[PDB]
Design a protein around this ligand. Structure first.
Ligand SMILES: *[C@@H]1O[C@H](CO)[C@@H](O)[C@H](O)[C@H]1NC(C)=O
Ligand SMILES: *[C@@H]1O[C@H](CO)[C@@H](O)[C@H](O)[C@H]1NC(C)=O
Lengths: 99, 50, 78
């Protein structure tokens, strides 16, 4: 699990500091606001719409992250496709013993 | 030119179920008692169909 | 599959927008870079510096909102 955690940490760190470039060729540095402006051009909105109201966009991003981490420390069925898989495997082996 | 083309795709199939005792033994009592010794085949089969 | 790969990168310093006379100027398709002597506009994938004109730049707002505005001149073919 530590190797997979290292992989995902490297992936998030590359995304936050390089952008879309470290999958095509090498890694090219860019500030995060200019990267978000390029992605805004990607969805069809001009760069200024990011640039005059960058602060409320950052606030909305931070609030959405904080709302996800709240909802994870709550009831089950969020991760229900994984747990079910685990259960199925265990169940099969139990049958093979009782049989 | 403007052209409209059709494409057909299957989505689901029929849901089925089986009574293990009725298929194997029918109405016989002796067969049912002998079938009790073959444990955990009919449950493992109904679970897959469900 | 034949594919295009970028090869040799180079560092520049950049700004989100430039301010000519009380107006913010944003690039159309490219980034503003500082060559070392002058400020140019260039496409991201290949380095081809272009002189900043009114053609490849658009205007929006005043120079008191954007973080990282700089002072530079926008050429007009007139
Ligand atoms: C300049 O580019 C080189 C690679 O070409 C890089 O190692 C170096 O960190 C860059 N300079 C700065 C100040 O980041
Ligand atoms: C851009 O910079 C290079 C070296 O930094 C210089 O030789 C060149 O003259 C500059 N471009 C212009 C248009 O002056």
């Amino acid at each position: 699990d530590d190797m997979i955690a290292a992989y995902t940490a490297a992936l998030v760190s590359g995304t936050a500091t390089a952008g879309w470039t470290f999958g095509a060729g090498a890694a090219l540095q860019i500030p995060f606001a200019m990267q978000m402006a390029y992605r805004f051009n990607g969805i069809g909105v001009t760069q200024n719409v990011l640039y005059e109201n960058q602060k409320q966009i950052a606030n909305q991003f931070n609030k959405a992250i904080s709302q996800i981490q709240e909802s994870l420390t709550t009831t089950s069925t969020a991760l229900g496709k994984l747990q079910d898989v685990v259960n199925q495997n265990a169940q099969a082996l139990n049958t093979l013993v009782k049989q | 030119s403007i052209s409209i083309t059709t494409e057909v795709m299957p989505v689901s199939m029929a849901k089925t179920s089986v009574d293990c005792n009725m298929y194997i033994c029918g109405d016989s009592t002796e067969c049912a008692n002998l079938l009790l010794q073959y444990g955990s085949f009919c449950t493992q089969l109904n679970r897959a169909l469900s | 599959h034949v594919t295009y790969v970028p090869s040799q990168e180079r560092n520049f310093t950049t700004a989100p927008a430039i301010c000519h006379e009380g107006k913010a100027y944003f690039p159309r398709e490219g980034v503003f870079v500082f060559n070392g002597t002058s400020w140019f506009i260039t496409q991201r994938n290949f380095f081809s510096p272009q002189i900043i004109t009114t053609d490849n730049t658009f205007v929006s707002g005043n120079c008191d909102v954007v973080i990282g505005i700089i002072n530079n001149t926008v050429y007009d073919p007139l």
